Design a protein around this ligand. Sequence first.
Ligand code: NAP
Ligand code: FOL
Ligand code: MN
Ligand code: MN
Ligand code: MN
Length: 159
Amino acid sequence: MISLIAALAVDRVIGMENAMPWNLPADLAWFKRNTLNKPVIMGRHTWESIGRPLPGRKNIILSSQPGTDDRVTWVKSVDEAIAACGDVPEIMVIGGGRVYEQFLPKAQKLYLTHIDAEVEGDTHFPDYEPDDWESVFSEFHDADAQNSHSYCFEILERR
Ligand SMILES: NC(=O)c1ccc[n+]([C@@H]2O[C@H](COP(=O)([O-])OP(=O)(O)OC[C@H]3O[C@@H](n4cnc5c(N)ncnc54)[C@H](OP(=O)(O)O)[C@@H]3O)[C@@H](O)[C@H]2O)c1
Ligand SMILES: Nc1nc(=O)c2nc(CNc3ccc(C(=O)N[C@@H](CCC(=O)O)C(=O)O)cc3)cnc2[nH]1
Ligand SMILES: [Mn+2]
Ligand SMILES: [Mn+2]
Ligand SMILES: [Mn+2]
């Protein structure tokens, strides 16, 4: 099973200038809980944005060019990325935009955080078709002293 996990600001913005400009610790904690002990697939730009391996997860990087760090696994195609995960129950695709586009048709589950923030960005989450997806979990949170925007955690499963 392939799942995508992402945090979206208004208008599906996910990034600007190879960064995420907001800071929502509760959402990073949600990301860690839902990815720990699973393989994570990311594109090369997202690998450079994170800047280090994510502990407790098999890190698989898509790039057309040879890898430059043996602390992670480098692959050259979608099919190779999936194969490198082995026989696990759930593969987590953690972006970015180009990678989400390619894995969306293959995904059975989306873990989405909707952030009430207006962000200029240069990268968007793919347009998906709402009729294809059932919302099975949602949890709204107001802003607090640690999280400066309101946010909604949602899990969707392909119908
Ligand atoms: N809000 C969120 O949830 C979230 C999550 C993740 C990322 N982001 C943001 O998203 C942005 C990065 O997204 P992006 O769309 O620019 O880049 P990306 O999807 O992270 O990386 C694209 C790169 O991945 C490689 N790649 C992708 N598909 C491939 C394939 N089929 N075969 C081989 N290589 C492949 C290529 O590397 P080469 O050029 O080396 O071939 C391509 O240039 C940043 O702003 C980041 O902060 C946000
Ligand atoms: N919901 C969601 N939020 C995100 O921030 C997110 N980020 C990415 C890609 N970028 C990043 C950037 C930083 C970390 C990070 O520092 N993670 C730590 C945080 C643990 C914590 O804060 O409690 C980790 O171990 O996962 C992960 C992914 C992909 N999907 C996402 N999905
Ligand atoms: Mn091939
Ligand atoms: Mn197998
Ligand atoms: Mn806001």
